[model samples]
Target: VVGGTEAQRNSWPSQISLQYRSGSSWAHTCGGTLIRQNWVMTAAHCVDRELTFRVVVGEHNLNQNDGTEQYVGVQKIVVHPYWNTDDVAAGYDIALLRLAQSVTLNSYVQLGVLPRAGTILANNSPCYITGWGLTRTNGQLAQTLQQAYLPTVDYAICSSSSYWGSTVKNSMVCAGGDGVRSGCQGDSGGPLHCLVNGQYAVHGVTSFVSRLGCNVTRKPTVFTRVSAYISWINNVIASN
Candidate 1:
């Protein structure tokens, strides 16, 4: 969340801190959206390293216990079968994690509302990218969750040669290439919450950022469009 401010604890209650087990303790690796009481949504690339994982719902700060946090072990993980780690720009970067137990709903922790399948935002639609990712390129992760207003960039403009060109697929959403406020890739899997119909919904899963820099102009942060995966997500949840 480069060029962002510390987010209010209750602002994005559906945000979760997805962590991997380090040698002696757990360490935050990526961010996720709480789609259900026992399911988390994140980018498949975040779990490509093959590490033991856990999710912390209702987390505000990484260094301190806020008392509202619900720690849950990941019982199952399902990445999109078409996902290819070597080619993230080809899309299909989404993944879901089944929790060991269902977490309790509260103000600090709640389910993320998602948009209908095939939904797409207009150019410059209002949205916010929330996560504990780095505050800048090659920087340390934020101690607290941070958020930046990153308006959606239309496909026509985002895919232009000066922008991402062919790498930005229709299955992806582009936002925040202003070279100011942007989402750095340090926290690869997180939510891009958009205000649609007066309600904030989880619209995007943090996927990739420009290799040139975190806030490069015209190279907006890319996300796996949640709307594009509604059917697949439902199928995974139903069959698992």
Candidate 2:
């Protein structure tokens, strides 16, 4: 019941998995949004190893079909440089992917911008998330694009909780369910989306959680705030 069957799958911006070969076998890693013709964004941890990853754009099936699936070698893996993984408070999860070659734009694949923080987040705010993650608890990776309807969680409600509370930081946002639908393993580094000026921008990046059960109420889908890292993202993009 998580992704509303097969028909609604196309509506989401597919979260790509960068798959590559090592000698004879292939390995997959989590990645999200094609922000520019030559760029994508993901978690620093996802790309921490560097040099062995690729970028798959507008993907639905694990095996690429209709959309362009480019083999992008990492040109650079720029962490905020000052980021400290030990500090849970830093939440320094954002990172950029510069493709080996630029991708041509098409309807099935389009770039998006970032939204500012302190923007109004209300009931049924109408947002979306997609990934090739587990369907059930500890299940195998979903072959096609799996999605969820994540209406914005009220800030007042989020802060009132002992888990998120006020210490959750202004540099972040939360989304999840009435204890049922949520992102699972293999979904990290996926995109959390919001529609602005008729375009679905990259609002957040899937981050960490204490548990793997999909719908843990106390853990509202934790995300790395897109707005807070805009300047850092720009500097990396500009210099490279």
Candidate 3:
């Protein structure tokens, strides 16, 4: 993210590193949230390439072995049926990945809590975006994970003409359009942990940023609203 700080190792246990096999090494491609022992929530666009993917839990750093990391192969991927890869603006950017085996939960690895179905945060609600994304626009990934306090930009202000306009939808959550801290490349599918009722829950799946830049003014980072898809998520897990 642009203008983010190094995150504490145990700060976001549900945060994970989604990687793909490169020539001989695994490369960090996106971020994801562990929603269950064997399931992860991410952005549909992250898996659109259909690469051999793996999920690394308790991952605080991508370039170094943290000893707490638990890598597991993805057994299955279920993208939202209505997701249009070509039309991210139309919403439905969420996806779920089934892990080959259940990951053991601990202080450094745990399932992310989801908000109630259809829950919506008030404008400027407190939140944070965490990931191993770039430290600056077009820069290399960080050696360690990063986080930024990116408050919620409710649909009203986000969809305004001077802001994201039509690109922002109710299905998505907009945060940090202040031209400072924001999610960049490699942060997609990560969590937007929002504080509500004395607890933090995974409220969003980092989806996209502006084409103009990662930290553009009036163009906050867009995410798939996790609350809006609670039923669909439960149904997917149950049916699968």
Candidate 4:
């Protein structure tokens, strides 16, 4: 695991957007990482052919703020081949966006690293998740990039039938509910991160819920474990 720097400590939704449509006015689906020059990872459901999304980086508010907002045309939008389409819930929700142009990295906006082999992230460790995702299920997104300390959860607790059951795979991690701040809707495909040696390594991608709302006991937040995808990510990164 690569630890995050002081700069990373301040990085936020300035790099993400939620693609939404209010009548004819389109909004971003959700916030995501600008992982590489032209590549970004977001939830597969965010892909839409009819609308345009403007990725806003370095800005706290969507409507009022002076920050770098880059509008890149999407050249190709790739969804997971077996992306689950069952519910509004995210299943196989991962996706990649190939932009017509790449982004110039800056403070408050950066990429995440994959963890090394044999590293273990313990439950109750100091970790974080950030995004423009909602503070509540029916509420609007926070004007500023919001963050919360995440407490790791045991896989057994997260996988029990009362929780997500088999939907919560071994290739995932669970975090939340000390009865405090937690990842909410719209954070999907965002990163579940830990700091190692001053670099923010993306431990997981925000994924799904068997139910709505945050901080439900026994119902932890589901995230895509990026550790197991290291080889796959490298192959894709090299090829792309």
Candidate 5:
């Protein structure tokens, strides 16, 4: 994330590294949240490359062994049927990956809690975006996990002319137009954990950012509103 700091180890247990097998090594391509023992929530575009994908749970640092990491192969990918790669602004960028085997839950790895369907945070709600994404636009991914405080920018304000305009939809969540901190490349599909009431929940899946830059004025980071897809997620999990 741009203008962020190193995250504490296992501080975000649900956060995971989605990697693709590249030659003799595995490359971290995107971030995901472990929503269930055998399922991961990410962006559809993350798996659009059609490469062999694997997930690493409980991973904090990419270049070093954290010992708590659990690697698992993706057995199936379920992209939202309406997702269009060319029209990300139209929304439906979410997807789920079923693991080959169910992972064990522990302090270092756990299921991400999802908000209730149709739940909406008030404007400027407290939230945090965490990932192993870049520290700057066009920069390399961070060696360690990073996090930034990216308060929610309600759809009404985010869709205003000075903001994302009509490109911001009700089905999406916008956060952090602060121009100092935001999600960047490699952060796609990570969780946007927000504090609602007294507890925290996964409210979004990092979707897109400004085309001009990662952190820009009036161009808050956009995310797939997880609450809007609660039914869809449950249906997929039940059928698969």
Candidate 6:
């Protein structure tokens, strides 16, 4: 994430590092939220490539061997049927990954609470975007998890011509267009945590940032609104 600070490991327990095998090493490719013991929610684009993937839970530093970490292989992936890789601007960029085995619950690893279906945060609601994504546009990814405060930008304002114009859809959520703090490359498929009633819930699945740049003004980071896909998620989990 661009303009972010190092995050405390346990602060976002549900946050996960999605990695792919790179030669003899595993490299973090995207961020994901552990929505269930054996399920993860991410952006469909993250798994578009046919590669072996693993998830690291309770991870902080990428190079550190923290005993709290739980490595699990991805058994199956289910991308939203409507998702079109060629047209991300059309939305539906969400996906779910089934783990080979169920993960254990602990203080350092847990499932993320999701927002109620159809729920929408008020304009400018307080929220946060967490990931191991790049520290800056075209820069290296952060070895440690990072986070930045990114208030929600309601659909009405985000879709305005001055902002994202027609690119930002209702199924998407926009946040942090200050051109200072925003999500960047390698952060895709991450979670957007919004505090509601004093409890934080995963409200979004990190989708795309501006094409011009990661932190461009009037071009806030856009995410797949999680609440909009509750039914589809439930169906996928129940049947698969």
How many clashes (backbone atoms < 3 Å, residues ≥3 apart in a chain or on different chains) does model 6 have? 0
* Each prediction's RMSD to truth: 0.7, 2.8, 0.7, 4.6, 0.7, 0.7
Residue lDDT tens for model 3, 140-237 = 88879999999999999999999998988999999998999999999999999999999999999999999989999999999999999999999999
Candidate 1: list runs displaced more than 4 Å. Answer: none
lDDT of 1 at 63: 98
**Candidate 6 Cα lDDT to native:** 0.95
Question: Could you give candidate 5's per-residue lDDT for residues 154-180 as a string of tens digits?
Answer: 988999999999998999999999999
What TM-score goes with each of the models?
0.99, 0.84, 0.99, 0.81, 0.99, 0.99
Per-residue CA lDDT of model 6 for 1-240, tens digit only, reads 999999987899999999999997899999999999999999999999999999999899999887899999999999999999999999999999999999998998989999999999999999999999989888899999999999999999999999999998999999999999999999999999999999999999999998789998888999999999999999999999
Q: List the residue pairs that clash in candidate 2.
A: none
> Per-model C-alpha lDDT, please?
0.93, 0.67, 0.94, 0.63, 0.94, 0.95
Q: How many clashing residue pairs appear in each of the predictions shown?
A: 0, 0, 0, 22, 0, 0
lDDT of 1 by residue, 1-113 (tens): 99999999999999999999999799999999999899999999999988999999999999997989999999999999999999998999999999999999999999999
Where does candidate 2 stray beyond 4 Å?
1-14, 20-23, 116-120
- Ranked by lDDT, the better of candidates 2 and 6 is 6
lDDT of 5 at 174: 96
What is the per-residue lDDT of model 2 for residues 49-152, given as tens digits with 9 covering 90 to 100? 64477777766677556545555665666766755666545677778878888876665566766776445556456677677766665667777777777766
* Candidate 4 per-residue lDDT over residues 1-240, each given as its tens digit: 011111233465324664545687756457676777677776666664455655555555556654566656567666766676675343556677777877676765566566885455776656677776777656666655666777677677767787677767666777774444566767777777777788667776777643556655566677777675666555666776
